[PDB]
Amino acid sequence: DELVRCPSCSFPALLDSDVKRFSCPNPHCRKETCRKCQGLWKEHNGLTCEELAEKDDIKYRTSIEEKMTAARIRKCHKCGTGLIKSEGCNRMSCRCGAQMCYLCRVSINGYDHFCQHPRSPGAPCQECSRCSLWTDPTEDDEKLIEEIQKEAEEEQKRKNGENTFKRIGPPLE
């Protein structure tokens, strides 16, 4: 016999010492949680406490790995194929024929989408607001990708408690 407090709202309930499922009596909580690891009961079926902890961790790490890949990849609006520009201007032609602006990723029909005025590298255009035809976004994208890895590093420090953190993507140069 043991008295247990809900891991969320702290409402108390009497539980048999051989029951692992905690069902909170609080009408405004109602959360069903595991009693050994405080994990959510629905997400817990068929898994041990360790297998659930690993499952949520992999879910998080892969979410950041794909968040970094998403910043680098251009997805064709028609066929969904991922594109990367090796060189050239910012007008992309996917193998399906559809065209897109490599900067803002919108679907376009031709060169009329782009600003072609005299324009210094990474400088605003004093005569339009269209996308630069020649600007290379590789450095800016690599910065955004690193911001994701750093923000994922700091959100790990909040959950773990200590200053323990493991890098998600590949290392630095």
Partner 1 sequence: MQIFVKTLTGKTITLEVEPSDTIENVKAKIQDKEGIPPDQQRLIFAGKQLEDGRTLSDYNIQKESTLHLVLRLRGG
Q: Which residues participate in catalysis according to the annotation?
A: 89
List the structure tokens of 35. 């009693």
Angstrom distance (rounded) from CA 92 to CA 117: 20
In the complex with Zn ion, the residue whose CB is nearer, 30 or 167, is 30
Check whether 125 is labelled as a binding-site residue.
yes
Check whether 9 is labelled as a binding-site residue.
yes
Catalog residues that contact partner 1 under the rule CB under 8 A: 58, 61-62, 65-66, 68-73, 79-95, 102, 141-142, 145, 167-171
Query: Which partner in Zn ion, partner 1, none is near 152 (CB below 5 to 8 A by kind)?
Result: none
Angstrom distance (rounded) from CA 109 to CA 71: 23
Query: Which partner in partner 1, Zn ion, none is near 69 (CB below 5 to 8 A by kind)?
Result: partner 1
Q: Using the rule CB under 5 A, is 103 a contact of Zn ion?
A: yes
Q: Using the rule CB under 5 A, is 24 a contact of Zn ion?
A: yes
Query: Which partner in Zn ion, partner 1, none is near 34 (CB below 5 to 8 A by kind)?
Result: Zn ion
Backbone angles phi, psi at 135, to 5 degrees: -60, 135
Backbone angles phi, psi at 64, to 5 degrees: -80, -40
Q: What is the DSSP string of 117-158?
A: S---TT---SS--SEESS---HHHHHHHHHHHHHHHHHHHHH
Show binding-site residues for Zn(2+). 6, 9, 24, 29, 34, 37, 44, 49, 76, 79, 94, 96, 101, 104, 117, 125
